[PDB]
């Protein structure tokens, strides 16, 4: 029912582990250079729809050849490839669609464009983060935002160290999945198995979990599937040390796991003056924050709210899936009074989800700064406020098991690590807003 498009090398279609599961499409667009030609692809197809080793054991697949025999392709090849899918999606429209790109090139304006245009058509795009031990945001389709970018983890859920390099990281990596010494279908023979590494393996794993999810609920959105892929991922398993101090905060400490089958929120970081951090088209912005390595506003943009931050600063958006919600942002300019700058969700049934300061149900900021409030109405939405103070570097306040963090803040940068609100400096009171069903 769930078709998983695979754009890779050729595949050993016969392979008894993925036999009749995979269909080989008449698409080939590979740059000039025999079993080794099927090698990478077959193993991934095995990882996804394998009879013995597969994640989504039953899943139907379709393969397009975009990589040659040394696994080298072209941006154009891939582009035309994705176009083939879009064209096929218009001919005999298939059910839930998952597109697997277990590849990496440099940053491509056109490919990320191709990916977004295709993703907006409600297609679940799963891609490898890259095996270069670098910020994924410099690679494509890795850098792409609507694409689920996947980093690879070893047997101890730590990041894969591939030769002198290893797994890519950064704010572009959506989550991490096992990608070291993976046993899957080997092209050596119709019944052979082999252990391969890399972010492709990681992507393919997630591509499987995604396929699994849509088998159960075909109507799921990309934004819904992402939020759930995040929610049910194993948290804080990775020793952040393996990454540069610079990239640690930005890198999600998630390790992919099967979601069994409610409010979901996610932290969205921006690139380093004005910085913008945006939510998915069906996601609501419930909070906005910012951060500097040294020392924010919620504005509207095309009928959709965005987190805007003013060396450079990161706009930190909190994107949530809040069914049937009437949200608005009310802003009160500096009062210059000793009490402070205040603003409240003056309406009834309209709860405060988050605050935003730049220079009960009420935001209190410094006298000289303008204060923004996120006021949302949703069917039965409770919103607690938890505070924590200590007499420092980082203080942390966290929502109780049943509450989703909608808004992290520092009492007069600061950000939300899963359901934990963090405040950073050199009494320090941290403020978290917790919302419910």
């Amino acid at each position, epitope marked *: 029912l769930v078709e998983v498009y695979l754009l890779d090398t050729s595949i050993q279609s016969d392979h008894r582990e993925i036999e009749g599961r995979v269909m080989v499409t008449d698409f080939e667009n590979v740059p000039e250079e025999a079993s080794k030609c099927d090698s990478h692809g077959t193993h991934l197809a095995g990882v996804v729809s394998g009879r013995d*080793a597969g994640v989504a054991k039953g899943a139907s697949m379709r393969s397009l050849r975009v990589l040659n025999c040394q696994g080298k392709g072209t941006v154009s090849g891939t582009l035309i490839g994705l176009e083939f899918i879009r064209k096929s999606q218009l001919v005999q429209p298939v059910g839930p669609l998952v597109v697997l790109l277990p590849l990496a090139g440099g940053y491509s304006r056109v490919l990320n464009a191709a990916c977004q245009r295709l993703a907006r058509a409600g297609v679940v795009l799963v891609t490898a983060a890259g095996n270069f031990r670098d910020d994924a945001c410099l690679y494509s389709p890795a850098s792409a935002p609507e694409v689920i970018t996947v980093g690879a983890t070893n047997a101890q859920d730590q990041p894969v160290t591939l030769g002198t390099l290893g797994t890519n990281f950064g704010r572009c990596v959506d989550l991490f999945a096992p990608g*070291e010494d993976i046993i899957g279908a080997s092209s050596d023979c119709s019944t052979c198995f082999v252990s391969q590494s890399g972010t492709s393996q990681a992507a393919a794993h997630v591509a499987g979990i995604a396929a699994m999810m849509l088998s159960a609920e075909p109507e799921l959105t990309l934004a819904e599937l992402r939020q759930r892929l995040i929610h049910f991922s194993a948290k804080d398993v990775i020793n952040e040390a393996w990454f540069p101090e610079d990239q640690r905060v930005l890198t999600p400490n998630l390790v992919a796991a099967l979601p069994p089958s409610q409010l979901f929120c996610r932290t969205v970081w921006s690139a380093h003056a004005t910085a913008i951090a945006r939510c998915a088209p069906d996601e609501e912005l419930l909070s906005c924050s910012s951060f500097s390595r040294s020392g924010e506003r919620m504005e509207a943009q095309g009928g959709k709210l965005v987190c805007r931050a003013h060396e450079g600063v990161y706009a930190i958006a909190r994107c949530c899936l809040l069914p049937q919600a009437n949200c608005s942002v009310h802003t009160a300019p500096p009062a210059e009074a000793s009490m402070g700058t205040r603003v409240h969700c003056h309406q009834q049934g309209h709860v405060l989800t988050g605050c935003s300061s730049h220079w009960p149900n009420q935001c209190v900021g410094h006298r000289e700064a303008s204060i923004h409030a996120s006021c949302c109405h949703a069917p039965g939405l409770e919103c607690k406020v938890k505070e924590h103070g200590i007499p420092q570097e980082q203080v942390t306040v966290a929502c109780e098991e049943g509450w989703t963090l909608t808004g992290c803040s520092a009492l007069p940068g600061a950000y939300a690590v899963d359901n934990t609100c963090v405040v950073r400096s050199r009494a320090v009171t941290a403020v978290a807003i917790c919302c419910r069903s």
Partner: antibody
Framework: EVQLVESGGGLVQPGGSLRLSCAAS????????IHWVRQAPGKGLEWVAR????????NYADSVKGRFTISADTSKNTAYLQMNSLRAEDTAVYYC??????????????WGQGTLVTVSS | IQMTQSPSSLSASVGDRVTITCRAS??????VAWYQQKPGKAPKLLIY???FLYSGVPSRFSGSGSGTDFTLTISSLQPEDFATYYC?????????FGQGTKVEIKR
């Protein structure tokens, strides 16, 4: 210097639970697949379940489905078999064996000594 | 999943060419293996991938196999060869063993 040390086995009552251990030494643990093959006294060999330590990927025998569960501790280099809802028929010598590393997945090159599981009231 | 060994017991003397038949539950390609277990001991691998002779296993040992029908051949039988032999269906998902063949000494 490649060995699969088998421990945890013994006597347990019907309906009871039992945990077993497979201590892997002298080879890259995560890299391979580890199986459990039981054998009732007068009877032959029966594969019960497998695991691929890095992936965590498993497959079981329909005979043992839902009752037994394979886990692996990559840090401690040990494979475990959690045998809940035990029957009387489950009486067997439990072997753990490693995959040859190539070709067909069920090819067991090295086998453990075996741990005895006796289950009766 | 039924994998059948023929015979269940064969008796022969040192030097004889011993043969053991094996029928897989379906076309299993060359996804077959042969194991030798001595009473009170753990089984020992002999042949894999239907014809591949595992390291250190004496050259006496041969493996033949179409897709359904397979055959272990112990050319020039030996005293230490007198043991119980298992067939293995190392095919994806459907994994089984044969009933076992006891290589007996004729007196």
């Amino acid at each position: 210097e490649v060995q699969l040390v088998e421990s945890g086995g013994g006597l347990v009552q019907p309906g009871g639970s039992l945990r077993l251990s497979c201590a892997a030494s002298g080879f890259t643990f995560s890299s391979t697949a580890i199986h459990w093959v039981r054998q009732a006294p007068g009877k032959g060999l029966e594969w019960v379940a497998r695991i691929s330590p890095a992936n965590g990927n498993t497959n079981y025998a329909d005979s043992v489905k839902g009752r037994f569960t394979i886990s692996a501790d990559t840090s401690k280099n040990t494979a475990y078999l959690q045998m809940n809802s035990l029957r009387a028929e489950d009486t067997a010598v439990y072997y753990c064996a490693r995959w040859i590393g190539s070709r067909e997945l069920y090819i067991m090159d090295y086998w453990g000594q075996g741990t005895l599981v006796t289950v009766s009231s | 999943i039924q994998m059948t060994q023929s015979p269940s017991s064969l008796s022969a003397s040192v030097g004889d060419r011993v043969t053991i038949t094996c029928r897989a539950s379906q076309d299993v390609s060359t996804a077959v293996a042969w194991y030798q277990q001595k009473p009170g001991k753990a089984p020992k691998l002999l042949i894999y991938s239907a014809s591949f002779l595992y390291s250190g296993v004496p050259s006496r040992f041969s493996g033949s196999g179409s897709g359904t029908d397979f055959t272990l051949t112990i050319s020039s039988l030996q005293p230490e060869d007198f043991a119980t032999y298992y067939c293995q269906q190392a095919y994806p998902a459907l994994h089984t063993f044969g009933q076992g063949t006891k290589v007996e000494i004729k007196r």
